[PDB]
A paper describes a structure:
Here, we study the RBP presented on the surface of rodent-borne paramyxoviruses Mossman and Nariva (MosV and NarV, respectively), viruses that constitute founding members of the recently defined Narmovirus genus within the Paramyxoviridae family. Crystallographic analysis of the C-terminal head region of the dimeric MosV and NarV RBPs demonstrates that while these glycoproteins retain the canonical six-bladed β-propeller fold found in other paramyxoviral RBPs, they lack the structural motifs associated with established paramyxovirus host-cell receptor entry pathways. Additionally, using an integrated crystallographic and small-angle X-ray scattering analysis, we confirm that MosV-RBP and NarV-RBP form homodimeric arrangements that are distinct from those adopted by other paramyxovirus RBPs.
For structural studies, minimal constructs bearing the C-terminal six-bladed β-propeller head domain of NarV-RBP (Glu184−Pro657, termed “NarV-RBPβ”) and MosV-RBP (Glu202−Thr632, termed “MosV-RBPβ”) tagged with a C-terminal hexahistidine tag were generated. Beyond the β-propeller head domain, the NarV-RBP constructs also included a small C-terminal extension of 31 residues of unknown function, which is not present in MosV-RBP and BAVV-RBP and lacks sequence conservation with other paramyxoviral RBPs. Subsequently, the NarV-RBPβ structure was phased using the partially built MosV-RBPβ structure as a molecular replacement model. These combined observations are suggestive that disordered N- and C-terminal residues of the narmovirus RBP are intrinsically flexible or require the stabilizing environment of the higher-order NarV-RBP and NarV-F assembly existing on the envelope surface to form an ordered state. The interface between NarV-RBP protomers is similarly substantial, with an occluded surface area of ~2,160 Å2 stabilized by 19 hydrogen bonds and three salt bridges. However, given that treatment of NarV-RBPβ with endoglycosidase F1 resulted in the reduction of molecular mass, it seems likely that the GlcNAc at Asn575 is occupied, yet mobile in the crystal. Despite exhibiting only 31.4% amino acid sequence identity, NarV-RBPβ and MosV-RBPβ present similar overall structures, where structural overlay results in a root-mean-square deviation (RMSD) of 1.6 Å over 401 aligned Cα atoms.
Residue numbers in the entry:
A (entry chain A): 198 to 626
B (entry chain B): 194 to 626
């Protein structure tokens, strides 16, 4: 492989416990020449970007389409792996080594990524017309595990819908875009499950986001089929990455009382303790920044963590109610990664100002350390994924983050893949 | 099951003798621009600059290169040289598009400048100038640079072979050898590409001067435009580099010098080999005083001749704000963005990427023997084209109406940023009129 630096998770317990410096100066934005050009001049669209880093190795994915952003049937699914290496300035930057594409049909939607020991893993939903229509049509999709490596291998294992192990019955299982982890021959990632409602568990509803939310509206926001009384559940997928014969693939269903709405998300594993942190992406009615800890006890709980009170904005044209089940949607752009084993500190890519310019937000226990735009003007952020890491040994003042985004660079075009890296302040105040 | 070496579309050169001989249709409708998701993102938001883009295609395999810098476009010392290889495969719509398989980077120091590319089978080749501060300062400092041959393949490892300046075999005497960006070809055991050599002036040969580009050109001004060192009486000559790509033991690297009466100024360029006949076509890039689209044929006789071919009378524009003379020595420069590829074994037909309008927007021009078949913008607005490279091919068997072209460019996408790598493909009209 290309000479690469050792890296370690920025949410390690060795992270700062102190109250952090509010970094006033401009950030040092360094290159991240990864991915590919995505037709900035010829109306090509990119969706579902995910970036993951493990010990100086990264894996990247996105979904490319022609002429619009809703063409799963004619989409191309991109996978990429590379290493983080010291650039001419002595700065660790990622560079690609291998790239693969999957040409639909079939399409691959909601791919989750993880990297472990120079190996890359991708879990995708095999589809033709996408998850929204798949649920309404009551399909039972195949799920495909991709195994990638720096020497150019891409192996696939089909997971039939009936093969999943679970303690209860469910209609169907879907993958969702985001970050996962590979631990103990298992690939853990967020998932979505269509399942009939049970009396004991109702929709999470009233809270600081919408104190007067109505329970019937909350249940409707989660419902899939009114006649079948099925609801879209958040889940954790535990996929076998060592066995190809009689593989043990498990789905852990989280009851719908643990989340306002099922969504895409990221899972983080604290290396020393094994605690699982999560970042539940938006796209529903809740405009809160949803992070927390996964606590498996008598059942799987999502213990919410208060990271920031800043709300996720609505699209430009929406003038309806904000942050309540019957109004505007909260955009899907925000993605926050933990800089602390208990998510006391987080760094995220966030939309800023009316054009939703891409920006970086540093928050510690509801204190905003900084909120800085990457660019101004009319550049609009659509989706983002962020991977922050530390060197071995850590820099006493900085961690490094890699941000990948989809952006509307020019009017009349479609969202474009862009990437960048930066030194993330970790100095105490 | 993914795009790979064995699962790729077969292609053939668009300058094959099997190309159309007829008078071509002037294509009025808009072109069908199809994806070319190659290269990488190049920091469109963080002021990163990309230079010297080159694309080459051979039988469904491509190789790409460019030079990346941080914070400015004049930082060889802190630059990164990118290499990439991939295949041309049928996209979901049934359209052949390029997709990357391998990517390599070379971290300065040392930097690698003026890389020329060639592809044969599944192997890729790059010939670069080992430098620290770039060719202009290297010539002024009278350095003798190393030249490095890079060997890449889709399933193999990137190897390098250093060519010392004293190791070159040649029939001529010269001071130093430089590579230049552009396309070359790999045939049999040789990698042929354009080069530049610093050499003392010869009594018999003066600078090419008066012509359709500058009817009133002055011979003294033309000779000055080619001169390197007046004290040493050295001039920058165009050359052809023949580099051994099969032998690791006793490699034979040869320099063929072209006398300075065959070209207005030495420059970067592209070489094309007609597969059936073996004739060599060339595209001499701009960046000097000549604002003509410089194409022609390389004829080795008693000496190496560059037989000019008149492809189009449209002139290459000058940079914004220049009020000196156009297309004549000692005045405004002609921008280096244009790149023209042959669609005909004798360059009767050409397709090029060209700057159009005041912002120098990227555009595609189709010309046949000085007749403009079309001149269409890719985009308008304030997007500015800086450099470009184009590779057009055929599907085997050829589509009766269309060839396929891949265009790679460096563009100023947003004000306050630096030139960005962008790529696109399109169906190139080849139908008769």
């Amino acid at each position: 492989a290309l000479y690469k630096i050792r890296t370690q998770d920025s949410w390690s317990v060795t992270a700062k416990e102190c109250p952090l410096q509010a970094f006033q100066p401009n950030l040092n934005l360094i290159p991240a020449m990864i991915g590919t050009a995505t037709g900035a001049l010829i109306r090509n669209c990119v969706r579902q970007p995910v970036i993951v880093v493990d010990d100086g190795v990264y894996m990247l994915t996105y979904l490319a389409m022609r002429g619009s952003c809703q063409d799963h049937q004619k989409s191309v699914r991109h996978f990429e792996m590379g290493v983080i290496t010291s650039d001419p300035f002595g700065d660790p930057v990622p560079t690609p080594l291998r790239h693969w594409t999957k040409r639909a049909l079939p399409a691959y939607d909601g791919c989750a990524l993880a990297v472990k020991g120079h190996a890359g893993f991708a879990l995708c939903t095999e589809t033709s017309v996408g998850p929204l229509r798949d649920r309404t049509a009551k399909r039972k999709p195949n799920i495909v595990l991709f195994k990638a490596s720096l020497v150019g291998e891409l192996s696939e294992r089909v997971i039939p819908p009936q093969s999943w192990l679970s303690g209860f019955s469910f209609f169907s299982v879907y993958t969702v875009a985001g970050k996962g982890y590979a631990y103990h021959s298992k690939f853990h990632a967020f998932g979505n499950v269509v399942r009939v409602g049970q009396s004991e568990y109702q929709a999470k509803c009233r809270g600081t986001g919408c104190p007067t939310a109505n329970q019937d509206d909350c249940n409707t926001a989660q419902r899939v089929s009114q006649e079948d009384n099925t609801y879209l559940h958040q889940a954790i997928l535990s996929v076998d990455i060592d066995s190809v014969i009689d593989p043990e693939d498990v789905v852990y269903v989280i009851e719908r009382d643990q989340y306002y709405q099922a969504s895409a998300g990221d899972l983080y594993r604290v290396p020393e303790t094994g605690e699982i942190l999560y970042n539940l992406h938006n796209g529903g009615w809740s405009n809160e920044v949803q992070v927390g800890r996964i606590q498996p006890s008598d059942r799987f709980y999502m213990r919410e963590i208060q990271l920031t009170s800043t709300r996720v904005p609505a699209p430009n044209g929406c003038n309806r109610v904000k942050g309540c089940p019957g109004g505007c949607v909260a955009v899907i752009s925000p993605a926050f990664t933990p800089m602390h084993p208990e998510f006391n500190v987080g760094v995220g890519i966030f939309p800023m100002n009316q054009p939703h310019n891409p920006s970086i937000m540093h928050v510690q226990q509801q204190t905003e350390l900084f909120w800085k735009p990457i660019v101004g003007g009319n550049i609009t952020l659509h989706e983002s994924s962020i991977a922050c890491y530390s060197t071995v040994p850590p820099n006493p003042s900085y961690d490094l983050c890699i941000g990948v985004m989809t952006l509307l660079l020019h009017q009349g075009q479609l969202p474009q893949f862009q990437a960048l890296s930066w030194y993330q302040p970790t100095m105490c105040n």
